[PDB]
Amino acid sequence: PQITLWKRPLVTIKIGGQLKEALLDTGADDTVLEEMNLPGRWKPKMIGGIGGFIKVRQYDQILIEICGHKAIGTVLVGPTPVNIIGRNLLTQIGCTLNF
Amino acid sequence: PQITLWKRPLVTIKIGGQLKEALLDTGADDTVLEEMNLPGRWKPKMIGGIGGFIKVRQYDQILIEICGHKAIGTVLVGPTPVNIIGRNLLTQIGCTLNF
Numbered sequence: 001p002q003i004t005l006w007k008r009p010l011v012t013i014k015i016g017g018q019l020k021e022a023l024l025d026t027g028a029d030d031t032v033l034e035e036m037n038l039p040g041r042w043k044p045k046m047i048g049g050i051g052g053f054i055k056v057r058q059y060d061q062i063l064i065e066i067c068g069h070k071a072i073g074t075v076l077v078g079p080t081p082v083n084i085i086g087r088n089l090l091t092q093i094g095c096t097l098n099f
Numbered sequence: 100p101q102i103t104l105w106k107r108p109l110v111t112i113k114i115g116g117q118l119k120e121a122l123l124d125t126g127a128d129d130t131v132l133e134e135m136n137l138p139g140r141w142k143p144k145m146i147g148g149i150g151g152f153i154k155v156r157q158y159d160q161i162l163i164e165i166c167g168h169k170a171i172g173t174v175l176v177g178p179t180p181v182n183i184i185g186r187n188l189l190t191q192i193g194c195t196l197n198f
């Protein structure tokens with residue numbers, strides 16, 4: 001679809017079989033979700049943003065469905081204030097900015 | 100134009116008579132620029148991202164040219180690691196996400 005930016009670009013995602021709301025964020029390199037129980041191995045990692053760094057769990061090769069488009073890639077899980085879909089998965093679903 | 104998301108979506112902006120590089124960021128409500136001395140009145144504000152909050156100076160009705168498209172709105176100035184163009188100005192240049 002085509003999404004304007006008058007409101008936050010929130011979409012429903014499906015991950016680990018659960019539905020969540022997440023923000024489509026072109027300013028994020030990486031995808032970061034709030035604390036949740038995901039199956040599989042994970043590695044400790046740190047990620048930095050506007051206010052500093054947080055500790056996250058890095059899950060590799062995770063299936064995530066974003067408005068019906070499938071992606072398989074890295075998901076970081078940790079104490080982010082908002083669920084963020086970053087460029088690592090926006091590219092897989094063919095997302096571009098247009099103006 | 101059309102901007103893909105393989106790399107950070109950095110563009111040249113013109114503000115306060117100066118040229119800068121900034122990130123087009125659908126995940127930001129507001130526009131936040133690195134420390135710069137802008138003339139006029141301002142209001143204190145705090146803005147939050149991953150990792151916490153930073154203190155910024157809020158300037159109103161600032162003109163910014165983004166790849167030749169003009170926008171006028173609120174600009175926050177403070178110790179951000181990167182210049183961020185947020186939805187308050189992306190809507191004015193007619194920017195959409197498409198997939």
Ligand SMILES: COC(=O)N[C@@H](C)C(=O)N[C@@H](Cc1ccccc1)[C@@H](O)C[C@H](Cc1ccccc1)NC(=O)O[C@H]1CO[C@H]2OCC[C@H]21
Binds near residue numbers: 027031125126181
């Ligand atoms: C209403 O609150 C706001 O609008 N807040 C605005 C200011 C804000 O912070 N928005 C972020 C999403 C967001 C986070 C928390 C709450 C609401 C929204 C992103 O849109 C922009 C940042 C920009 C940035 C790039 C490089 C280095 C530092 C900062 N990107 C980011 O934090 O990305 C992380 C994940 O991926 C990695 O890549 C870059 C850094 C890492």
